[PDB]
């Protein structure tokens, strides 16, 4: 697939970021997308062998360029609050109408106005009740990733140390702990249902702050890290 | 493209009705894109030329109709995995010959499961040493609303899939009791509340 | 009132990268061994189109140069021609328009080493091959519906560009 880096990123207002996209082996056309929860999926700009062929409706601070080997890069310099979205890259053969369009997994960005609001998630896993065991003869586990912002969390359940898509049902959207202010402290949750050697682990991979961003606040620095809660 | 229904509710085994309407000053070069959770958009099916009745991946099909100016993604057999954000992309071909993909606003097809034998219960889960109350095993007819107190949080119903078993099923640090936070909306009167 | 794009692509072995000529006709000339390395114009009535056209077209056929390099390397396999060196590609796509400026008919016939190759018909939906290797090009240019896209270019930036070209006469 179209491998994309960085996978998830956090910055502040006015800071510069650069995203990288590499198309499929042999693909020479590249498109850029931005996915906002409100406005949907917006087209950014499309490159084709060192040539930007098409562009979307975005301010002048969204720029990209493609090298000779079809690799393309996207960078954003002046970060406004509307820059919080998931950034997608696409590939093609030559821009054929029927060549399909292989999209990437995207990069999600959110712009904190102040560094002090970035926190590492507090993640705990709640053991299943015996009431469920007596009722449906099964077990469900309720994880809680609380107090993290922004919500650039990849909450993946790793049962016996490996990612599982069977029995896992993680919230499509974390709920805001305090919705009064523009920022938040989102508290996530997840339900893993199975039928004591199992290792149901609610890994909430927080993609926090980078090394470039200088920090002046007193407390600890929550850079990208792993916050694992196991039961 | 204007996808009219933000939240489409389809039972397991009903005609999917993911309505897509396109408004272009040119020929309809239509495309369906399924966005599975934690992944990117994947290709479903396309109508360029030929048969009005088209077919695509995962058993999906569409009926390009000039009698409705619509490209409804139809699927006779509904799966839980169909619960995804479906994008109807019309590639408005630039005069030059490069496709500029314009998508819809996203249709959140929830594919509400058909629970064969619901037995709703509300059992509490404790920490490894705040506590959550879980509402589960209720039919898709129930609608859940948010809470009043800012200390009390309500988590949305989640359709977990026992694909190994072919089975499906849809907090505070305070005096707070799990027998509460349910006056918010309609609840099944037979819900099981262990006190 | 036509619009032809004779895309001469000589491999020029030895020295290095293929030497490309992009003489188009209604005009323009992208000598890839010239000094400008930009889309230097060869027509009087094209100067009236500004940076929204010069940079766009310059980058477009900078991309087309690599496209022709790739297709020339492809015909190294298709014809299995002698790899001893020079082998010229002659693209000849384009479209005619009536005095009204609407799409009359389109023509995309390919010419490798003077002779014929894949050729587009009057219907603008089905090509017409010329030899055993051309049918391979048929397969991919009918599978990805490239016929439709080249149609809507020929019913498009061909038609629209030639409309603007006829408008260039003030």
């Amino acid at each position: 697939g179209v491998t994309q880096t960085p996978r998830y990123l956090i910055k502040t207002r006015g800071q510069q970021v650069t995203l990288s996209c590499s198309p499929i082996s042999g693909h020479r056309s590249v498109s850029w997308y931005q996915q906002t929860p409100g406005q949907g999926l917006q087209f950014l700009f499309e490159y084709f062998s060192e040539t930007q062929r098409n562009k979307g409706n975005f301010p002048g601070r969204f720029s990209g360029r493609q090298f000779s080997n079809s690799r393309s890069e996207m960078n954003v310099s002046t970060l406004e609050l509307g820059d919080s979205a998931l950034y997608l890259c696409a590939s093609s053969l030559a821009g054929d109408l029927g060549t399909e369009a292989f999209f990437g997994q995207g990069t999600r960005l959110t712009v904190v106005e102040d560094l002090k609001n970035v926190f590492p998630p507090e993640v705990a896993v709640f053991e299943p009740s015996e009431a469920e065991i007596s009722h449906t003869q099964k077990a469900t586990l309720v994880c809680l990733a609380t107090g993290f912002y922004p919500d650039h969390v990849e909450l993946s359940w790793w049962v016996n140390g490996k990612e599982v898509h069977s029995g896992v049902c993680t919230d499509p959207q974390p709920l805001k702990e305090q919705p009064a202010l523009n920022d938040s402290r989102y508290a996530l949750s997840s339900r893993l249902r199975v039928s004591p050697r199992n290792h149901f682990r609610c890994q909430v991979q927080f993609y926090g702050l980078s090394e470039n961003d200088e920090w002046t606040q007193d407390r600890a620095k929550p850079v990208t890290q792993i916050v694992s809660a196991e039961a | 493209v204007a996808q009219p229904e933000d939240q489409v509710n389809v039972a397991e085994g009903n005609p999917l009705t993911v309505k897509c309407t396109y408004s272009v000053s040119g020929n309809p070069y239509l495309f369906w894109y399924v966005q599975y959770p934690n992944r990117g958009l994947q290709f479903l099916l396309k109508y360029i030329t030929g048969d009005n009745l088209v077919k695509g991946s995962y058993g999906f099909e569409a009926e390009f109709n000039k009698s409705q100016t619509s490209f409804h993604l139809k699927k006779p057999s509904a799966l839980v995995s169909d619960s995804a954000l479906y994008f109807c992309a019309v590639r408005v071909v630039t005069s030059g010959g490069s496709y500029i993909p314009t998508f819809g606003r996203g249709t959140s097809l929830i594919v509400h499961p058909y629970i064969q034998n619901p037995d709703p219960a509300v059992y509490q889960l404790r920490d490894s040493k705040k506590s959550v109350c879980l509402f589960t095993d209720f039919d898709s007819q129930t609608n859940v609303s948010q809470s009043k107190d800012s200390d009390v949080y309500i988590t949305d119903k989640c359709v977990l899939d026992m694909r190994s078993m072919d089975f499906k099923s849809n907090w505070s640090n305070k005096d707070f009791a799990c027998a509460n936070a349910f006056n918010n909306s309609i609840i099944p009167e037979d819900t099981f509340f262990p006190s | 009132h036509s619009m032809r794009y004779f895309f001469t692509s000589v491999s020029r072995p030895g020295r290095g990268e293929p030497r490309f000529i992009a003489v188009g006709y209604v005009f323009v000339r992208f000598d890839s061994d010239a000094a400008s390395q930009k889309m230097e114009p060869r027509a009087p009535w094209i100067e009236q189109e500004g940076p929204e056209y010069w940079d766009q077209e310059t980058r477009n056929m900078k991309a087309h140069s690599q496209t022709d390099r790739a297709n020339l390397g492809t015909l190294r396999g298709y014809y299995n021609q002698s790899e001893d060196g020079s082998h010229t590609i002659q693209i000849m796509y384009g479209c005619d328009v009536g005095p009204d400026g609407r799409f009359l008919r389109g023509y995309r016939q390919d010419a490798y080493d003077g002779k014929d190759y894949i050729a587009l018909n009057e219907d603008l939906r089905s090509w017409t091959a010329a030899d055993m290797a051309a049918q391979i090009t048929k397969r991919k240019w009918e599978a990805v519906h490239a016929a439709e896209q080249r149609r809507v270019y020929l019913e498009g930036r061909c038609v629209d560009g030639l409309r603007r070209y006829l408008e260039n006469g003030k």
């Binding site: 084709f48 040539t51 062929r53 053969l93 030559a94 821009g95 054929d96 | 630039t94 030059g96 010959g97 490069s98 | 794009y5 992009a22 188009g24 323009v28 056209y53 077209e57 477009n60 056929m61 991309a63 087309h64 496209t67 022709d68 790739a70 297709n71 492809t74 015909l75 298709y78 796509y93 390919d110 090009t137 991919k140 240019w141 490239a146 896209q149 080249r150 270019y153 498009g156 930036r157 061909c158 629209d160 560009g161 603007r164």
Partner: peptide, 9 residues
């Protein structure tokens, strides 16, 4: 104007 759809052989 030199279609940006340069289709490959």
């Amino acid at each position: 104007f030199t279609s940006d759809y340069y289709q490959l052989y």
